[PDB]
Design a protein around this ligand. Structure first.
Ligand SMILES: CCCCCCCCCCCCCCCCCC(=O)OC[C@H](CO[C@@H]1O[C@H](CO[C@H]2O[C@H](CO)[C@H](O)[C@H](O)[C@H]2O)[C@H](O)[C@H](O)[C@H]1O)OC(=O)CCCCCCCCCCCCCCCCC
Ligand code: CLA
Ligand code: CLA
Ligand code: CLA
Ligand code: CLA
Ligand code: CLA
Ligand code: CLA
Ligand code: CLA
Ligand SMILES: CCCCCCCCCCCCCCCCCC(=O)OC[C@H](CO[C@@H]1O[C@H](CO)[C@H](O)[C@H](O)[C@H]1O)OC(=O)CCCCCCCCCCCCCCCCC
Ligand SMILES: CCCCCCCCCCCCO[C@H]1O[C@H](CO)[C@@H](O[C@H]2O[C@H](CO)[C@@H](O)[C@H](O)[C@H]2O)[C@H](O)[C@H]1O
Ligand code: SF4
Ligand code: SF4
Lengths: 37, 67, 144, 165, 80, 64, 124, 40
């Protein structure tokens, strides 16, 4: 039951290499330029 | 119009070994002698920087020509 | 002596311009104006590069930071024997006279000045950093 | 023998190494005539090579499996098995000369610090003074001990600048 | 802003004030030295931290000291 | 009257001075009550190239 | 003060710049993005189609090249979105405002993707 | 002549002479006692 499906690398590698980094960079960029009250 | 001609000064500098025995003679800063090792390096870095030893353009030119 | 008032109408030195002048900071944050009276037309060096001719009488130039105005002040004072002054001009029109602060240049001691940032001890008498630890921020023993 | 080494005079690798070195020179010597200058130079090199291998074996050097002499540095082993001339004796040769240089320089430095302009005597050497000190430096080991015993070799801590602590 | 402090070893030679490229320092009356004047640092919001003042000070150790602090447009020397 | 005699040798005691534990020659001693009246001159210049400095009365002790 | 040159100050140059959608005020920011989006989306397909990893495949080249260009348009649109979030937090031209830039970014996405699609139609 | 002999006493000239002499002594010893590796 522990074995992931044969297609997992096709999804997780793009997910952690392109998608999540893109979200993280976008989220961080807005945070570091946000102006305090 | 100035005429192009030969023009020199007779015997401008006496030939003597007196200044050979006075390191740093050429510069007002270094002629007083060392107090730190930086003096030794400064002696060599400034040796040929003729225009830093005087402002007279004639004096600089003569040093360049003989060098 | 009283604080001078800036006259924007003052003519500026003859100068063809350069790429070393003001930027968007002047429009949004602040810029600096230096003025002086010239005895005669004369060529001086711009701190931003190039040669300019100062007009006889009042002169006015604008610069992007305070160091540029004081750099030209040093040149005019030492090489031409002039007495410039400069201001800080804010985008909303406010003018803050800066230099010389009290009409007398700082290198000459003047009455009425109050000492600031003067410690009545030697450098060797500062306390150890351990004594100012956890004071609310980063601070040197020289700040006490 | 010591540390599994063998004498170079009894080492097959040591003997083989000499043959190779001479063989290399012999090959070059073939292209030159008997009396030509290159032939004389090559033979002189060959004589020096043979003397070298003869001398090292005579001196009793130990050779490794590579056939190269290996030196012995422990004073006990060196003195017990006649290898004192490799490291031990050279050790005291160096320290005598090195201390000679150091002691002579120290004397000159102290001598000129009593002059009107000490720094001028450091870039323009007082050769008459320097020469006298050079000859007297042969007895530095005796002179140095006397200063150590008299308490004059070292300066007192109260006269040495240090930074705050 | 940087932090500039004057210490009571000042001899009132005025050289730090003459060397400041930002007009941060000035001379004020004093009675602790023969010159009867001491250096002062009234306008430290303009200090860029170049330490030309420290280079000019003759006393040993220094009588004017710069401690680099928080960076603003002025202290960074930006013209933009 | 106050301080060491002019031309005498003194030893510097200021820890942060370049010439701490070194010997200099007294130039003058201000009698006006200033903080550091004793002026001392040294043979060896400090890192800034200076050979003279001012010291307090208790920061100098007679050489030897 | 400033150095004036024919490149910086010329009549032909100034008139051309004012005609571009970036400098054409009085136009809705969304329309500005669409016009800018279409122009950039169309050209973007070129290099991907002719120089991509599938360039030599007969028919897959057009699909892969334009499909990759569409992905780059989406990334660019995201860059515009976050830029507006950062730049405009607290005036004459509505484009330089929090609401205006968001509309402008949305137009760029729609125009850019359409431009990529139109380029694909031209190829085939 | 005094000044010239003073010039010959400067550090670079003394160093040149002394190291020329020291090198000559070391070279000549190896010329007459070639390939010395140990003391016998
Ligand atoms: C995951 C990867 C993350 C990568 C992040 C990269 C960061 C780069 C920026 C570093 C920097 O701008 O850094 C600058 C700061 C500066 O630090 C602090 O800067 C301060 C600045 O003060 C100023 O600013 C202060 C602000 O509060 C105050 O206002 C203060 O008054 C004012 O003076 C003070 O000077 C502090 O004393 C000082 O410590 O950090 C430093 O310089 C050093 C901080 C790190 C210390 C440890 C370094 C160890 C390196 C080992 C070698 C690498 C080997 C890698 C091998 C890998 C093999 C596979
Ligand atoms: C810190 C530990 C660690 C590290 C360095 C890696 C590293 C890697 N993992 Mg793995 N992974 C881990 C833990 C880790 N994994 C764990 C605990 C799980 C079980 C939940 C998985 C499940 C997992 C899958 C399903 C896949 C990878 C894959 C990968 C590769 C690409 C990155 C990726 O897709 O991550 C994805 C990471 C996760 C889904 C788990 C992240 C968990 C932490 C808490 C965040 C890479 C070699 C991919 C691969 O094998 O490509 C060839 C892939 O498809 N990992
Ligand atoms: C782990 C990270 C990662 C991943 C998963 C990829 C993945 C890919 N890279 Mg690489 N790349 C990466 C990091 C990564 N790269 C980095 C860090 C760099 C910089 C050094 C590069 C630089 C680089 C270059 C220079 C190129 C690639 C290319 C490729 C493609 C190679 C296969 C191919 O022939 O595609 C052929 C293309 C396709 C089959 C199209 C696939 C779909 C496209 C890319 C997106 C479509 C989006 C869709 C229209 C709308 C959104 C849908 C979504 C919400 C589901 C593939 C998509 C090649 C390529 O084709 O890029 C476009 C290429 O030329 N990469
Ligand atoms: C740098 C450190 C060092 C080290 C690691 C050694 C190591 C050694 N020395 Mg050497 N030695 C040294 C420095 C050193 N020595 C110095 C500086 C001197 C001059 C004072 C000597 C003088 C010396 C003598 C006279 C002898 C050795 C011997 C030895 C060997 C056996 C004895 C022993 O246990 O020594 C361990 C070393 C130490 C604990 C440090 C002090 C050693 C003293 C100076 C000598 C002890 C000799 C020992 C009592 C002899 C026992 C009988 C012997 C047949 C085994 C051993 C390989 C012996 C040997 O094998 O000779 C062939 C021997 O007879 N050494
Ligand atoms: C009079 C000469 C002299 C003497 C007696 C010493 C003595 C000493 N030095 Mg010093 N030193 C000297 C010159 C001298 N030094 C010079 C010229 C330099 C600049 C290259 C240095 C640089 C130096 C360093 C960087 C260090 C020492 C250290 C030491 C100590 C350990 C020995 C050592 O490491 O030597 C090493 C020697 C050298 C690196 C330079 C030797 C150069 C020559 C051979 C010296 C004589 C030249 C001189 C012109 C002769 C004048 C003759 C006169 C009749 C005219 C020891 C107290 C070490 C220390 O502090 O240990 C605690 C240490 O770290 N020395
Ligand atoms: C790496 C650079 C590169 C490459 C390989 C391509 C490739 C292509 N371009 Mg593109 N193009 C590029 C950059 C590039 N372009 C740039 C930077 C611009 C702006 C100056 C343009 C502007 C442009 C136009 C206006 C047109 C093309 C067209 C074309 C096609 C070639 C001409 C033809 O057959 O008609 C082909 C798809 C033509 C085409 O068919 O587009 C669909 C076309 O009309 N390109
Ligand atoms: C500058 C260096 C350079 C160049 C020219 C190329 C070129 C190429 N690479 Mg390579 N690559 C490089 C560096 C470079 N690479 C590096 C450093 C890496 C390691 C990270 C890689 C890794 C890599 C991978 C992994 C892949 C490539 C691939 C490619 C091809 C397709 C790329 C693509 O789709 O671009 C698309 C390009 C654009 C969208 C930008 C176009 C820019 C235009 C032309 C500028 C025009 C300006 C214009 C004149 C201004 C006019 C102004 C006004 C008048 C309007 C292409 C042949 C892919 C391939 O299949 O190769 C055969 C591929 O898979 N490269
Ligand atoms: C740590 C450094 C170091 C050491 C310890 C040695 C040691 C040695 N080298 Mg080597 N060498 C070194 C560095 C070193 N070298 C470097 C850096 C180079 C490159 C320039 C060389 C190049 C080199 C060559 C080319 C040669 C040597 C040779 C020698 C030997 C010379 C013995 C001699 O002349 O006795 C002579 C006897 C003396 C006592 C000399 C001192 C004389 C005074 C007057 C004594 C006064 C006493 C009272 C000796 C084994 C020679 C040799 O035959 O080696 C096997 C040899 O040919 N060396
Ligand atoms: C004037 C007359 C001079 C005569 C003369 O010199 O003859 C030279 C003499 C004799 O010369 C030798 O013997 C015969 C002549 O007597 C032969 O004919 C040859 O000349 C020669 O083989 O040789 C020596 O004195 C050579 C001594 C070599 C000593 C080398 C010691 C190396 C030690 C290295 C230690 C390294 C330490 C640091 C490492 C620490 C760890 C990192
Ligand atoms: C003081 C004069 C002593 C002369 C001794 C002559 C050799 C006598 C036989 C010794 C055999 C064993 O060697 C012993 O003496 C050597 C003398 O160099 C030492 O070396 C060795 O560390 C010691 O173990
Ligand atoms: S650091 Fe520079 S700007 Fe600041 S007070 Fe000193 S000289 Fe002036
Ligand atoms: S340079 Fe030093 S001694 Fe002179 S006025 Fe400034 S702080 Fe005082």
């Amino acid at each position: 039951p522990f074995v992931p499906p044969s297609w997992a690398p096709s999804v997780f590698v793009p997910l952690t290499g392109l998608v999540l980094p893109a979200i993280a960079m976008a989220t961080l960029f807005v945070y570091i330029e946000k102006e305090a009250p | 119009a100035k005429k192009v001609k030969i023009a020199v000064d007779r015997n401008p500098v006496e030939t003597s070994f007196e200044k050979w025995a006075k390191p740093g003679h050429f510069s007002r800063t270094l002629s007083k002698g060392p107090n730190t090792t930086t003096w030794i390096w400064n002696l060599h870095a400034d040796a040929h920087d003729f225009d830093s030893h005087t402002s007279d353009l004639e004096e600089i030119s003569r040093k360049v020509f003989s060098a | 002596w009283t604080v001078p008032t800036l006259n924007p109408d003052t003519p500026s030195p003859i100068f063809g311009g350069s790429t070393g002048g003001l930027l968007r900071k002047a429009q949004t944050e602040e810029f600096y104006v230096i003025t002086w009276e010239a005895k005669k037309e004369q060529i001086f060096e711009m701190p931003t590069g190039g040669a300019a001719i100062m007009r006889q009488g009042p002169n006015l130039l604008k610069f992007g930071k305070k160091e540029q105005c004081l750099a030209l002040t040093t040149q005019l004072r030492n090489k031409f024997k002039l007495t410039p002054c400069f201001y800080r001009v804010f985008p909303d029109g406010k003018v803050q006279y800066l230099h010389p602060a009290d009409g007398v240049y700082p290198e000459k001691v003047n009455a009425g000045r109050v000492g600031a940032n003067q410690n009545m001890r030697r450098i060797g008498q500062n306390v150890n950093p351990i004594k100012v630890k956890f004071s609310g921020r980063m601070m040197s023993p020289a700040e006490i | 023998d010591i540390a599994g080494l063998t004498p170079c005079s009894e080492s097959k690798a040591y003997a083989k190494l000499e043959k190779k070195e001479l063989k290399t020179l012999e090959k070059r010597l073939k292209q030159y005539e008997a009396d030509s200058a290159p032939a004389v130079a090559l033979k002189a090199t060959m004589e020096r090579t043979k003397a070298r291998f003869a001398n090292y074996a005579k001196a009793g050097l130990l050779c490794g499996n590579d056939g190269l002499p290996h030196l012995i540095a422990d004073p006990g082993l060196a003195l017990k098995y006649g290898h004192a001339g490799e490291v031990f004796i050279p050790t005291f040769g160096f320290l005598y000369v090195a201390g000679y240089i150091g002691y002579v320089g120290r004397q000159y430095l102290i001598a000129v610090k009593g002059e009107a302009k000490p720094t001028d005597k450091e870039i323009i050497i007082d050769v008459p003074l320097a020469t006298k000190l050079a000859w007297q430096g042969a007895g530095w080991p005796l002179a140095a001990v006397q200063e150590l015993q008299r308490g004059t070799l070292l300066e007192k801590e109260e006269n040495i600048t240090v930074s705050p602590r | 802003a940087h932090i500039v402090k004057i210490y009571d070893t000042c001899i009132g030679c005025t050289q730090c004030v003459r060397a400041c490229p930002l007009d941060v320092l000035e001379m004020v009356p004093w009675d602790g030295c023969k010159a009867s004047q001491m250096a002062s640092a009234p306008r430290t919001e303009d200090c860029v931290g170049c330490k030309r003042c420290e280079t000019a000070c003759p006393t040993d150790f220094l009588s004017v000291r710069v401690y680099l602090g928080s960076e603003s447009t002025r202290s960074m020397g930006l013209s933009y | 009257e106050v301080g060491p005699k002019r031309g005498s040798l003194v030893k510097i005691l200021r820890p942060e001075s370049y010439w701490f534990n070194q010997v200099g020659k007294v130039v003058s001693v201000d009698q006006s009550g200033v903080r550091y009246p004793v002026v001392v001159r040294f043979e060896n210049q400090n890192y800034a190239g200076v050979t003279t400095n001012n010291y307090a009365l208790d920061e100098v002790v007679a050489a030897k | 003060g400033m150095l004036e040159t024919p490149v910086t100050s010329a009549p032909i140059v100034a008139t051309y710049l004012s005609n571009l959608p970036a400098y054409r005020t009085g136009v809705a920011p969304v329309l500005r993005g669409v016009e800018i989006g279409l122009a950039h989306g169309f050209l973007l397909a070129g290099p991907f189609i002719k120089l991509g990893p599938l360039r030599n495949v007969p028919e897959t080249a057009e699909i892969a090249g334009s499909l990759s260009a569409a992905g780059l348009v989406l990334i660019l649109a995201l860059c515009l979105s976050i830029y507006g979030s950062a730049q405009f937090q607290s005036a004459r031209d509505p484009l330089f405002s929090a609401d205006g830039w968001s509309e402008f970014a949305a137009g760029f996405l729609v125009g850019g993707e359409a431009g990529v699609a139109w380029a694909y139609v031209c190829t085939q | 002549m005094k000044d010239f002999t003073t010039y010959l006493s400067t550090a670079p000239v003394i160093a040149t002479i002394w190291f020329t002499f020291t090198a000559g002594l070391l070279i000549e010893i190896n010329r007459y006692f070639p390939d010395p590796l140990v003391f016998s």
